[PDB]
Design a binder for these strands. Structure first.
Ligand SMILES: Nc1nc2[nH]cnc2c(=O)[nH]1
Ligand SMILES: Nc1nc2[nH]cnc2c(=O)[nH]1
Lengths: 338, 338
DNA sequence: AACGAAAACGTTTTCGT
DNA sequence: AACGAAAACGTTTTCGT
């Protein structure tokens, strides 16, 4: 079809391609004519041909976990902004923590020859770690580990643990000594990592959390609903609660309400994530905020670098969580005694 | 590189490609050898080359509005399932109702040669309608108009109006005669269309809604926060409210709560969308449910068809909303008198 | 000064025999 | 029976002059 263009214009495809990409000077006269044709013929230059030659697709792949999930969704929207910004195309792939699913997208991707790979897989068993390596040749950055699991990738770290700690501290300095926790999946960073951050502060304060007070969630609202329940559904309950994620929080919220419990007047809740609309949670949610735009833009950036300035060595940038005080927490019994 | 494979195996690339795609019979002996090489050499067949020949990318493009937005997010996750299912690659593009933005993604897409285009642009001015047409050559389906705006596309219709009506009716049959409404952007279907569905039921019932009782939203929580406010912030307020979208509802919820109003005991609220986690809204939200998985799978389907069974004529499938009773509504003053 | 001719990128596929 | 040789898909780019 560029051949067809060259012809309508009576110039060489070379000339055509020169004008279409301003890659060498062309007489105006000639230049307009190309356009002229470029426009009657209704020409859409083929990137597949181009990429075929120039060897890069100006396209990047997101090998994600899921995308409805608020938290996720937010990061992704971010990353896409950056792609569009710097002229890249985003191929979105959810593998739902499925390994096969994952080996499958990985492959489709390599085959479609993405210029780089952004990874958000949530859990990283040796077998996944392994497949990932088989692709060290395509540049890539995992945006969700807490420390650096591998030497063949760029890593952006969230300081999830320090976030965990922040949370604890708050409750503590608020008068709280009877706290419970609904962590998220321990095989995840934002899972384990936040729990431990929280657990240091406790240990530091000589607060012990009775195992009947810690209930695993999975970041989905229903998980928090049951958690809260099981907690408040007991003889002795805590005065305050640290919930691993806002969405679950939001579930913890509804259940308390359903047992006729008042938050924060009857139970205090502090979440984690600071999702776009936690402020409209009801009681406005006090939570730890996770930089998600920066987590995205930063990730894109390390990838571009590698991609463009052909980097070889792995790199890692930290990011920082930070407390947002909202309306879900109240003074505990010890506030005054400190 | 297939050349390199053929060689390690000492067979022709033709043979190689035959085995890699079981497209003609090959001796086992020969076949294994190809694999053998295919695997030491660590070969990843290039789809760009392939597509270059076979003329199809087995890749589909989503020219969306935004993707954080719960509603949206949900549909997209759907569509991606279908892509993965039937071996397609999803290129996600948000144009944020930006025209330029839109002409830009449209183009990148055509240039990357997507096999079909899934459109979710929300608003459709003549100028967008116009650009869209310039691409009638690439197959496509708009998944968000209410009636069929054009003859050069497949359309999936939501029956948004009948949903509007359903909502009204409910409040009506619940004893309500003093209702307010926070519609969404009127230049959108789920905007206009739902309002009118609601407005027929009113007219039908001889209920009039005092203009000081209808407040435009934009589907984002903050919009509903202010809306609710402005409503309850007045001398005379309605006993019940119809909110155009769940997320805004969720905002309407928080504000009522912030004015010390009890829902549904002080005001009733009925939303619309039945977003994944409206049940964990607090008071569990009674809303109209929009089939979003089916809206997605159905869309993919009409596209595949066109794509595969090379269809020429436009088509349109309707889908149906349906009432979900939750805990946000209460009997109105006239329930008993009917 | 301003532009062309021809090879190459990595496949698939028609005919061969 | 089972496989090869060679053209083609739509570009970009080196050398020309
Ligand atoms: N949905 C969800 N939210 C999160 N917030 C932090 N980690 C996660 C995760 O794995 N899933
Ligand atoms: N966010 C959002 N939710 C919706 N629900 C129905 N239409 C819309 C829309 O345009 N945006």
């Amino acid at each position: 079809t560029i051949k067809d263009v060259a012809k309508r214009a009576n110039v060489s495809t070379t000339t055509v391609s020169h004008v279409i990409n301003k890659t060498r000077f062309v007489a105006e006269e000639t230049r307009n004519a190309v356009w002229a044709a470029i426009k009657e013929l209704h020409y859409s230059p083929s990137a597949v041909a181009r990429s075929l030659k120039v060897n890069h697709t100006k396209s990047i792949g997101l090998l994600a976990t899921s995308s409805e999930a608020a938290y996720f969704a937010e990061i992704i929207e971010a990353v896409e902004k950056n792609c569009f910004q710097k002229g890249y195309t985003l191929i979105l792939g959810n593998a739902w923590n499925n390994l096969e699913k994952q080996r499958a997208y990985l492959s489709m991707m390599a085959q479609k020859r993405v210029d780089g790979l952004l990874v958000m897989c949530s859990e990283y068993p040796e077998p996944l770690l392994a497949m990932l390596e088989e692709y060290r040749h395509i540049p890539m950055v995992v945006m969700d580990w807490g420390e650096a699991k591998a030497d063949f990738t760029d890593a952006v770290i969230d300081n999830a643990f320090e976030g965990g700690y922040m949370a604890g501290r708050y409750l503590i300095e608020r008068g709280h000594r009877e706290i419970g926790v609904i962590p998220g999946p321990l095989e995840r960073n934002t899972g384990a990592g936040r729990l431990a951050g929280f657990m240091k502060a406790m240990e530091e304060a000589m607060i012990k959390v009775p195992e009947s007070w810690i209930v695993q969630g999975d970041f989905e609202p229903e998980s928090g609903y049951r958690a809260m329940q099981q907690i408040l559904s007991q003889p002795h309950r805590p005065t305050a609660v640290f919930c691993g994620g806002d969405i679950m929080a939001m579930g913890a919220l509804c259940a308390a309400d359903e047992m006729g419990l008042r938050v924060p007047q009857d139970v205090s809740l502090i979440g984690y994530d600071n999702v776009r609309n936690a402020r409209y949670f009801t009681p406005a949610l006090t939570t730890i905020h996770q930089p998600k735009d920066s987590l995205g833009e930063t990730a894109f950036n390390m990838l571009l670098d590698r991609i463009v300035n052909k980097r070889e060595e792995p790199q890692s940038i930290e990011v920082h969580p930070r407390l947002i005080e909202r309306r879900s927490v109240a003074d505990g019994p010890f506030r005054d005694y400190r």
